[PDB]
Paper text:
Previously, [name] (formerly termed Bleg1_2437 and Bleg1_2478) from [name] was identified as a member of the metallo-hydrolase-like MBL-fold superfamily which exhibited enzymatic activity and predicted structural characteristics similar to the B3 subclass metallo-β-lactamase (MBL) antibiotics-degrading enzyme (E.C. 3.5.2.6). MBLs degrade β-lactam antibiotics by breaking the four-membered β-lactam ring, destructing their core structure and deactivating the antibacterial properties, thus conferring antimicrobial resistance to bacteria. On the other hand, GLXII (E.C. 3.1.2.6) is one of the key enzymes in the glyoxalase system involved in the detoxification of methylglyoxal, a cytotoxic product of glycolysis and other metabolic activities by converting S-D-lactoylglutathione (SLG) to produce non-toxic D-lactate in the presence of glutathione (GSH).
The crystal structure of [name] solved at 1.44 Å resolution unveiled structural features which may have contributed to its promiscuity and evolutionary divergence. Diffraction of [name] single protein crystal showed that it has a space group of P41212 with one molecule in each asymmetric unit, completeness of 98% and Rmerge of 0.045. Solved 3D structure of [name] showed a global topology of an αβ/βα sandwich fold, with the active binuclear center located at the interface of N and C-terminal domain. At the binuclear center, both zinc ions are coordinated via trigonal bipyramidal geometry in which Zn1 is coordinated by His-54, His-56, and His-131 residues, while Zn2 is coordinated by Asp-58, His-59, and His-191 residues. The zinc ions are separated by a distance of 3.3 Å and are bridged by Asp-150 residue and a water molecule, Wat1. Another water molecule, Wat2, is interacting with Zn2 at the apical or axial position. Analyses on the global structure of [name], L1 B3 MBL, YcbL and GloB GLXIIs revealed that the enzyme showed higher resemblance to GLXII, particularly to YcbL, a GLXII-2. Yet, the active site architecture of [name] resembled that of L1 B3 MBL, which allowed the accommodation of β-lactam other than SLG. The insertion of active-site loop in the N-terminal domain of [name] active site formed a configuration similar to B3 MBL binding cavity which eventually allowed the accommodation of β-lactams. We propose that [name] could possibly have evolved from GLXII and adopted MBL activity through this insertion.
Author numbering: 1 to 209
The structure:
Amino acid sequence: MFKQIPLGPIQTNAYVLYNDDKEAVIFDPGGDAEALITWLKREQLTPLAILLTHAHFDHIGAVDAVRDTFSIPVYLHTKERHWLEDPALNGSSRLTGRPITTAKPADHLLTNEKSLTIGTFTFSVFHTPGHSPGSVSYYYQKEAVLFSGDVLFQQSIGRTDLRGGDHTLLLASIHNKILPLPERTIVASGHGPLTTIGQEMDHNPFLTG
Ligand SMILES: [Zn+2]
Ligand SMILES: [Zn+2]
């Protein structure tokens, strides 16, 4: 009940989660806005919200166009609230030499909520910093999928060398908050192929402790 959609030159994975009523939740629309918008329209899906795992430039480049086209709210953790509009904070200037920004701040700011309901989609919310200070992971129990951004990938873990990066915090997020989830849970991460909690527990070389 979701699609992984790599977008932009970085090929960061956006996700569209949907239901049988053709309503949808968008995660991390990072680039190539027109490819994402036209796909949603071809599929006759009605998006309800944009949920951001974090505000690095490669996850936000299509936010303006998607937000404007569909008149939907943007959710982001308060610790990164300044990052959307500031290219000196979100990595674009430093990592690519060009500024990437939104034109408006997020209209919903997350803090310590453990649950979030978007229409009839309910998520458990975990604050999972280490790759970035406002990184959050959205667990959708109904279809056993975790939209965890750049914390945990297939065969690797998030880089901890960017603004506010902290490897000691990232490993705690992984061991204490992500890996206790059910082993069949799909890890729908920001970069690379899908995986599951169980597969990474057994085979991710950065997770032998
Ligand atoms: Zn990132
Ligand atoms: Zn990323």
